[model samples]
Target: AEKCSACGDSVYAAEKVIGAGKPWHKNCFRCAKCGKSLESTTLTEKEGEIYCKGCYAKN
Candidate 1:
């Protein structure tokens, strides 16, 4: 079982989205700034943190 780096919860195989050397849940993947769902946007990472495209561009 791979753990989601974002929420620190177990990521089930059916709901996992792998990226940035970590596993994440489809629902658990969110932007650090606005908590927006990242499922429909490109994921951006900075210094080991994940953000949505919009938030990443703003910060």
Candidate 2:
């Protein structure tokens, strides 16, 4: 089973994929902080961390 890189949560098998060398899923994947859905969501990585648009907006 695929797992979240940050939290080690098990991701749904069908949705899991290797993205940018990290494990991710369309449905099970989420923002590292707010845990919001990541499907069709834009993300940014800085210093090896991931952030969703809303969180990024605050920075």
Candidate 3:
């Protein structure tokens, strides 16, 4: 098991996917601002926080 990037909890492969090239719970892979769940392809990060394109564009 690996520590999830979002919650800092133990992460198992069956429970979620990856984010920021790191392990994350499926629910934990959500956009930081909008709370929209993200897929591996569309998620983005900034200063260790994750966000979607819509939210990231606000930067």
Candidate number achieving the greatest TM-score relative to the actual structure:
1
TM-score of each: 0.64, 0.45, 0.57
* Residue pairs with backbone overlap in model 2: none
After superposing candidate 1 on the true structure, give the runs of residues whose Cα lies further than 4 Å from its correct spot.
57-59
Candidate 3 deviant stretches above 4 angstroms: 54-59
Number of the top-ranking candidate, with lDDT as the measure: 1
Q: Write the per-residue lDDT of candidate 3 for residues 1-59, one digit (tens) a residue.
A: 47785678889767767564577787777887887867656667677577776676677
lDDT of 2 at 11: 70
Put down candidate 1 lDDT per residue, 1-59, tens digits, no spaces.
48986678888877687666687888877777787877644567567566677875676
| Distance from true location, Cα of 48 in model 3, Å | 4.2
Whole-model alpha-carbon lDDT for candidate 3: 0.71
Per-residue alpha-carbon lDDT of model 2 for 1-59, expressed as tens digits?
36766556767656674455566656545666666755434455445555466766776
Stretches of candidate 2 off by over 4 Å are 1-19, 40-42, 46-49
Ordered by lDDT, highest first, the candidates read: 1, 3, 2
